[PDB]
Amino acid sequence: NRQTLCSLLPRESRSHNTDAALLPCISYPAFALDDEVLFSQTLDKVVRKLKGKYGFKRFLRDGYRTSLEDPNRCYYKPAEIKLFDGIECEFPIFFLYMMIDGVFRGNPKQVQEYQDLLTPVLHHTTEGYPVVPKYYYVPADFVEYEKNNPGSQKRFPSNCGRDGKLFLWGQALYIIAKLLADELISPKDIDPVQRYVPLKDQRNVSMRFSNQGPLENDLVVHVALIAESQRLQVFLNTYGIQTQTPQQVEPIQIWPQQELVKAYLQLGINEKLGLSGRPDRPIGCLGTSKIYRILGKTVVCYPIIFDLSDFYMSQDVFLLIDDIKNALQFIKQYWKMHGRPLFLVLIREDNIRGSRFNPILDMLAALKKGIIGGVKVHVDRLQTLISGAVVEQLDFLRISDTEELPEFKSFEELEPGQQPDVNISEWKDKPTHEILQKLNDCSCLASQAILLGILLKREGPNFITKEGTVSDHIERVYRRAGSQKLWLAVRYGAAFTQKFSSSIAPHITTFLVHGKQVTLGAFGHEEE
Amino acid sequence: ETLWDKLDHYYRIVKSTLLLYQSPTTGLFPTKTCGGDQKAKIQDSLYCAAGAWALALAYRRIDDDKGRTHELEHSAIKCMRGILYCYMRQADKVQQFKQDPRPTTCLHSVFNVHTGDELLSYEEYGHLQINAVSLYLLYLVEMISSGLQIIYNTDEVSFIQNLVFCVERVYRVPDFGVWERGSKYNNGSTELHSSSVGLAKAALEAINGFNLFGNQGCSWSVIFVDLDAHNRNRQTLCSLLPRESRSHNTDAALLPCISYPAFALDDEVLFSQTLDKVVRKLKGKYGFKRFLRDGYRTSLEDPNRCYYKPAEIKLFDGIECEFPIFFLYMMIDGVFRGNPKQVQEYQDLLTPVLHHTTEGYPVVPKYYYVPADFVEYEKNNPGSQKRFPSNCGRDGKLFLWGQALYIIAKLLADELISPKDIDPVQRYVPLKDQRNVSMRFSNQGPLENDLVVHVALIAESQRLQVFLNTYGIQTQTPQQVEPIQIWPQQELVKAYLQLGINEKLGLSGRPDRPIGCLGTSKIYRILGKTVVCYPIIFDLSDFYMSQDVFLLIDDIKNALQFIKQYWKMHGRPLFLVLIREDNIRGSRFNPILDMLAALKKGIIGGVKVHVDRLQTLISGAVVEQLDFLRISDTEELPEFKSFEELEPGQQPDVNISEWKDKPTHEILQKLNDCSCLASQAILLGILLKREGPNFITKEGTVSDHIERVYRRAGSQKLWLAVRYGAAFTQKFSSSIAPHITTFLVHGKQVTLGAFGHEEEVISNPLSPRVIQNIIYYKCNTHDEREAVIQQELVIHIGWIISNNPELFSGMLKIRIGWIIHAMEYELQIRGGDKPALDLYQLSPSEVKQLLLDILQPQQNGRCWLNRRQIDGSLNRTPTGFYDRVWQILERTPNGIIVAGKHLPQQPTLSDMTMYEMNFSLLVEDTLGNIDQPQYRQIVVELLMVVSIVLERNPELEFQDKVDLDRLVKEAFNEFQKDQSRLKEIEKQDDMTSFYNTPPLGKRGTCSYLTKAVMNLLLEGEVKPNNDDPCLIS
């Protein structure tokens, strides 16, 4: 949500480059934006393009209760939106939000400028009580004159109060603004949770600002190198890295992220209201970076970067080292909680196998030096790192219906061709059992994936193979060339077995949250 | 520059010029950076630890601190767990100081930096500096709040509580102060310093309810302050607040109090009145003078003699050492109080006076002294000469307290630490935020005070609840509130006796004093039950004052008004009006029903109240959880008793004198023929003396028959007997001592003793048992009925000082014997020819209305003989009398002699300043021998006239000593002569006519006195003056 608001921030939406609904957000009640430059970039566009004598236009090209709007038709038809340019209704409430923003942000002359603007537009009821008209519309007879010289004509109120019509939201905001302006209530009183953080105080506010402040970001993520086995800890120590096996941290339990997703599934479960619990999604790098107290035990979670996957990308160690750098950089840019983040670098014996050892040791060594990617880190023993740290106490688990506490499994010590010769096209025109013939004469795990992948289609999921169900032989060839680092096979295998990663969907949202749109599809072929 | 580089600059200065010096062992920092002195002062170490902590608060804004946050923070803990060690070794002294706070029972304030052992003894050094114990507690709260874990076990919490029990009673313990000397005179004298009481008010506001374990804390780690003792400190500070003490009208130690670290004052007008005097009278080019007439390391000071001798203090006027640190406090005050131009004005003043060490690190010289060769030139034109630093740093000498304040001020000014960061407990409350801060501000704000006290009318019996309901008041018996337990205050005093009890450190618990109206106004959770306490106003007592219902109704109004003025805690106060069946007996019913009815209406005395059922009133209220009781040693919880439903002569004929000359068994004879409970008290009270405590009486031991007659006439409302009985049985009230502290906290001094007899002066807070000797043995040896009436007036005056303080303005020494005299005279003037009523026969309440009537501003109407007798007897002085007497002494070379006393120009002009409270007491001592009270008013008027003549006419000055009696005699003799010419009155040396003459009028008293003064002044040289140089000369 922070990433989406920021990507879209000077603006409101694809359609509106400014809306006056941004004023309720950027400032009372939410006080959401945490960038002073975007607040000024957003407010200045809202004031400049939306302010009026009688209020702030909700958005430019707005047809609400405009004289030119058709009352019967709910939906404006294409290009109608032009007819409402200069006729836009101006809502006096936005003057009241600007007065509340001024009291909060210490501008005693933005309260006056907008109080002065509201005293004229404010109607009064028969007993003298002020009525904030919801909108001020240009009367139909004067629409063309306003469109010609905008700001010239006189707009009639929408509710005068004596009419018996009152804008209850605006009536309430008059009380909030008038009390705040008259100092009969304090900014602190109406923002008990401190949504407005004055700049000088933008330092240690959770989920928003970090000790370093609003601008500086050199977080030191608290790395803990955890080794799958004692064998690997002793091997890693000989080569320079002190790591701790899952058992050496006995009270602390290292859990896959998925085991926290199982625990959270019990949060908000009400059977009286038919509610179920956290939706089963992945906890990510800003939630696996927290220490949790779940059912009386301290749980630290390995990041989702270390979660084993069918996709062939997992096999490249260089991608793991990069996902570790990429995760720590995300934790640096976007972790604004009180404690130092805790990244646990689970090392599996497969990660050091073969020449993956030299790349992994350099990552592990930089993690020991204190910098991997511009992200400063402090590798240390989990017990020392978890010691005075804030622990999220997950108390919703309780005992609930079952008189037993839920069963949570925790990571445990694992105690001990140049080109495919077989081209797809020339070998798929054949329907022959001969593809099953070359299958016995193909040492290429890429010719095998192409030959044993033509058959996942023409003969079927289980057409018998010499080896067994075809589905098993492609998964054997995919897995085999994944290890032998035979990447043409790993990709013919993944494709033929139609493999998709859990992360494709989570990443396609990075594109979307950032205002980008992804098209999948080849070049010269159907795009989507 | 990166933050790392910006703050590495301060880490180099902190590590070289402050943390190098921290004792490896104790943690305390040394006063002398270079040398063999082993002295670590307590205050300077606290300021040094605060300086390291301020750098840690800055390094917390950098995640890659490289260890500097842990080291700088843990250095602060080291210094603070080192002061605790020094104090914890001297916890034999913390127990002795709670019980007998005294200069020679105090925790030492200078310790061996290397070992933590006592270095200087009580004779060698004035260790009673409660600024230090109090700043230890403000800093422990401010550091534990920050995240710094200084208190480690329950025993350390019990010592911090016992340290609190000591810091609560500071108002009554006079001390040496931040400056270690006491007053400007180094006479070895302790005085109450606004600075020490102000830091104590602040430690107590901060530590009330602070888990000293911090975040890792429970209910058993909280410190509990007495809301009543804190109030007594607030009351003392505010009655000494533009000033610092009886000696100093301003001191720069007020700046550490009024603003960082304590931020104590809660009045913005007094803060400005206090700061402005400090800046105006103490600021300098090189720093702020600690106090005017200060001899610290002055060129003229004798190094060998510790104690300045009388009038030496003049030699130090203009030579005063100027401490650059005060510029740093003013810069910290500016950062806190949002003045970005007071930080600059005082930064600009400090950049020049700041020396630098060889490596470039700034050295704040402790003081800048005028060199000896230039002393006279500075005295002649102060601010002209150049003063040499005291420490240049290169010398190897650094002021570690000033080094630490540079780090705090420079970090705060550079915005590398925030005001919020170094005041985690919010000691500074910006005006706009002065609303809901406990013990300081209430929802209504800083100025508005219409508190609605939550009254709960509790009835002794169901019988009384049903009786009260028939007559209109719904009350609830103690049982009807079943879960809630109503306890006497004394049962909370028993419970609190278990707070801070450590047998390992020899600590005992809260001292056994009374909890008062701001502590019985709280709901308490003691041992799993909710306890609400009846006020101490409802506590039964031997003293006869309890019998007057009108005094109970007034004590109820007086208590609720105190609760309104001085309760600033979160909940609404809870006053429980216990009604006893004795209270409604007889015609006490009509007065009690009107109080109970007004309590039902919602207003009794201007204090709005909400009577309601206790269960509803106690429901969402904050309850103080008294978790210290636990089970402790005994496996049983303590046994606390709670209020339970009590289920069903015209004149004494026998005169003392004519019946005491007799030793006869005949006094025992009339005893059988006296129906007067006043003749019986006089007859059976002669015998408590001559025959003995148990001389057999027909009735039984005499001690039993006077206690029967006292109690009997107490009920029959026979007040002459109740007072002869109380006196003869020598009865003293628990409240005489608590009230005599109202006088003292308010800057007044009580004198007990009769008019015309031995007076005594209680100038300092005293024990009930010392106060009792003063009233029954030392002062009243002729009539003891006087001691009961004087005890009656101290109780009445004490609540009047607390709630209506200005009915006693112009009064600095409240002579209760003289005030009783004014009352006996008011009864005669009121009486007319008909004989005057005997003050002694009057009911306690009638004696309170007589007092309130005599204290009422004398208005146009009474004879000017009556106006004078009342004003003179009350010792009321026209406003500025004391300042005007200074002006008379300044322009009189040989002094004023009144009634055989003499205010000489020196040593007073040399040792004192115009508004010094010490002078007001010297003027009051000089006018002490004036026996006649109307003569005191004429002498007060001559002095007021001499001030107008001297001020209006600047040329005339007295040659010889002014004998105020001779100027008065010459004025009366002129009046005698002029009135004789009108009608030849034959009374001689009778000044009654003179006293009756109005002060100003055709031929009034003020003319005669002006004339006399002018004849004396004109008999001497008329100095040609330049303000209005003579035109004809």
Add this chain to the structure above:
Amino acid sequence: RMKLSGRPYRHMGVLGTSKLYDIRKTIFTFTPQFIDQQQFYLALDNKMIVEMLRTDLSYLCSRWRMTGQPTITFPISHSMLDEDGTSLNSSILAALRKMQDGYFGGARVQTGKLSEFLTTSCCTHLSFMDPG
């Protein structure tokens, strides 16, 4: 300030002079004791140095219980050459060739450039040597 004067001069054996040291951001490697001690006849004999090196390697293979892999820096001095100077001592060659073969001194030895050994060594950091 508290009159503490560093560490007494203690001879660093093979164990101490087998880690790499980070002194003022530049890596310092230290040759064993037996090489710089050329003040008695033992250093003149190249066979002795071979034997001292073998003893040091045998001690290292058994007593190294440290993170990292130990690194013995063995510089071949001019005294380690033969009489002519155009050839190296036979004993010293033989020892070096056995170390290249992986085994010498009861220990498995990996020979290679010192730059390669940074990533898998006990690169302890001497922060007390930084100025200031």
